[PDB]
């Protein structure tokens, strides 16, 4: 949700407008090219085109791909463990296909197809690893851009200061050129702190949330194959829930 972006730039824009100065003192078309274009050009040197495409994919996943609730994961696995206890293991095909969650039908499908549990863990732990690697790579790209933008804004500020010293004519315009040269640094810090750094941390946090759910699903899938009691399956999977989540789960199950 872009609610954070609207609030971030809205409060910043309000802060500039809060002072009696017009907003034109913060606008500089040349400063945008030095900061945005300079840091973007360093990103082109830093990263190949393949990393940019993977970053764009992982960014779109954040705004669209929601996931599955951990309360639903335990609720489904507990019922699946219960049903696989009353009936046989080769009786959950109707339930397996009706699961509205990827990586869980696939994990359960190699359980009914009789592949070794250790190979199931390795196959589905690698899927966790590539998800983590994809998010970490995209997060590092955004964090790298979050370091480039203020660095190139500082370079643009230094250029403005050096130019001002060379053309030193009026002492009453020295401070005016001081603030005009600082626009590049303001652009760099604003883009780093309102766009790049929070979005990179967003990918890192979203990776950890997904990794916990995938490990919880993998734990349930392995417990279905090596048939455990529904009490043991629930007790094993409850550990992934926070204390607030356990009370919510206890009411339903």
């Amino acid at each position: 949700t872009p609610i954070g972006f609207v609030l971030c730039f809205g409060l910043v824009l309000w802060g500039m407008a809060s002072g009696g100065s017009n907003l034109k003192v913060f606008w500089d078309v040349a400063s945008v090219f030095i900061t945005i274009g300079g840091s973007m050009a360093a990103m082109l040197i830093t990263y190949p085109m393949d990393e940019f495409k993977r970053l764009l994919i992982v960014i779109r996943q954040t705004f669209k791909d929601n996931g599955m609730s951990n309360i639903d994961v335990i609720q489904n696995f507990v019922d699946l463990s219960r049903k696989a206890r009353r009936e046989g293991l080769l009786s959950l095909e109707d339930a397996i296909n009706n699961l509205t969650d990827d990586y869980m039908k696939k994990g359960l499908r190699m359980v009914v197809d009789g592949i070794e549990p250790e190979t199931i863990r390795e196959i589905m732990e690698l899927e966790i690893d590539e998800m983590e690697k994809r998010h970490k790579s995209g997060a590092d790209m955004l964090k790298t851009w979050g370091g480039y933008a203020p660095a190139f804004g500082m370079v643009g500020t230094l250029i403005g200061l050096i130019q001002m010293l060379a053309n030193l004519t009026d002492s009453s315009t020295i401070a005016s050129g001081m603030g005009k040269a600082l626009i590049t640094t303001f652009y760099g810090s604003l883009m780093a702190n309102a766009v790049f750094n929070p979005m990179g941390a967003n990918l890192m946090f979203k990776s950890g949330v997904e990794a916990t759910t995938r490990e919880m699903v993998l734990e349930g899938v392995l417990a279905i194959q090596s048939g455990v009691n529904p009490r043991i399956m629930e007790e094993k999977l409850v550990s992934y829930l926070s204390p607030p989540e356990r009370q919510a789960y206890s009411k339903v199950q």
Partner: protein
């Protein structure tokens, strides 16, 4: 035989009850009377007994022979435990 579990003391039954698998215990409890299950229900925790309640009920009509083989597993566990410290 499996019908001799009633005469055993509560301490001896409690040890073997948590050793016998719930499926094995459920399979061997269909061939025994209701009084046998009472000495089993009491010598188990509420959670363990509750799991036994659903396991016996949701197992389905099983062949007479399958019940017979299950009782051997339970009746043989106490056989080696006779000299291990259990008093009969």
């Amino acid at each position: 035989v499996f019908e001799d579990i009633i005469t055993l003391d509560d301490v001896a039954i409690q040890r073997v009850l948590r050793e016998v698998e719930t499926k094995d215990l459920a399979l061997a409890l269909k061939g025994s009377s209701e009084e046998v299950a009472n000495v089993i229900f009491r010598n188990q925790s509420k959670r363990a007994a509750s799991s036994l309640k659903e396991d016996i009920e949701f197992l389905g009509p099983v062949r007479i022979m399958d019940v017979e083989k299950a009782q051997q597993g339970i009746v043989s566990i106490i056989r080696r435990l006779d000299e291990a410290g259990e008093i009969v």
